[PDB]
Amino acid sequence: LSAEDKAAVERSKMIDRNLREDGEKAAREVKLLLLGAGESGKSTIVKQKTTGIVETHFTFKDLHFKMFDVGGQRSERKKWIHCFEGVTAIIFCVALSDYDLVLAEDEEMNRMHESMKLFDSICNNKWFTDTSIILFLNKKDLFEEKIKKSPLTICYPEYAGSNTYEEAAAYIQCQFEDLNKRKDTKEIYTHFTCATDTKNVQFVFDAVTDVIIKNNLKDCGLF
């Protein structure tokens, strides 16, 4: 038709090609939903002004992870959780040493109970039927001496076991794993780590590789 219309069509095709070549790398740029309780070891995990979602870009073995820390979002979580359907996994950093102290400023609710409620909310969302949770339990070093004096009776008056480190970690593991109401399509990965412990990148790499194997079975038509 007109030359101006042909120029507009050519510009539209050029920017469609640019958009295609810029959005093709968004599949390679894998993304993670990092969330957790306040001062629960979430700040020290990211080392391995918008006042909103903090963006951290890091890679391991050429995979280009993205983490969306939602620590500065004080709004209602229900109405913005639907923007994370394209996330591949959920990182849930909570501290094991936060079982006895409730707020360190007031006495109405333990931090571990609120963490359990948050995990049950974020694990049974209809948006995350098939998003595997990478549960993280960090700062075990402070939990080593904090279990010798204070038993689990402060946090749970139903323990009735042995006041030892391994059984305490196993019982916290058992409480967190049983929060999942559908174990068939959902698998929750857990890693034990400290504030000065390495090999978290290996765990999250194994996690993301397993989830994308599930994806590759899904699109090929087998899973």
Q: From 48-56, 94-102, 103-111, 114-122, give the range in contact with other proteins by CB under 8 A.
A: 48-56
Q: Is 4 in the site for other proteins (CB under 8 A)?
A: no
Q: Is 157 in the site for other proteins (CB under 8 A)?
A: no
Among 39, 48, 83, 202, the residue binding other proteins under the rule CB under 8 A is 83
Token pair, residue 66, equals 């993205």
Cα dist from 165 to 96, 98, 111, 190, 201, whole Å: 11, 14, 19, 17, 25
By the 8 A CB rule, do 165 and 147 touch? yes
Q: Is 191 in the site for other proteins (CB under 8 A)?
A: no
Q: Is 198 in the site for other proteins (CB under 8 A)?
A: no
Q: Is 7 in the site for other proteins (CB under 8 A)?
A: no
> Rounded distance, CA 186 to CA 117, Å?
18
Q: Is 47 in the site for other proteins (CB under 8 A)?
A: no
Among 158, 166, 178, 219, the residue binding other proteins under the rule CB under 8 A is 219
> Rounded distance, CA 17 to CA 11, Å?
10
Residue 198 assigned to a binding site: no
By the 8 A CB rule, do 151 and 159 touch? yes
Residue 42 assigned to a binding site: yes
Q: CA dihedral in degrees (77, 80, 81, 84; nearest 10)?
A: -150
Token pair, residue 161, equals 């076991």
Question: For 64, how many CA atoms within 13 A lie in the half-sphere containing its CB?
Answer: 6
Residues in contact with 176: Cβ distance below 8 Å, sequence separation at least 6, in sequence order: 116, 119, 135, 188, 190
**In the bound complex, what is the minimum distance in angstroms from residue 214's beta carbon to other proteins?**
5
H or E segment and range at residue 26 = helix 25-28
H or E segment and range at residue 222 = none
Residue 12 assigned to a binding site: no
**In the bound complex, what is the minimum distance in angstroms from residue 65's beta carbon to other proteins?**
12
SS3 of residue 151 by DSSP: coil
**In the bound complex, what is the minimum distance in angstroms from residue 109's beta carbon to other proteins?**
22
Among 4, 28, 149, 166, the residue binding other proteins under the rule CB under 8 A is 28
Q: Is 8 in the site for other proteins (CB under 8 A)?
A: yes
Q: From 98-106, 110-118, 190-198, 214-222, give the range in contact with other proteins by CB under 8 A.
A: 214-222
> Rounded distance, CA 69 to CA 176, Å?
21
Among 141, 167, 197, 210, the residue binding other proteins under the rule CB under 8 A is 210
Which residues in this chain contact other proteins in the complex, by CB under 8 A? 5, 8-9, 11-12, 15-16, 18-20, 22-24, 26-28, 49-53, 55, 61-63, 72-76, 79-80, 83, 85-86, 132, 183-185, 187, 189, 209-217, 219-223
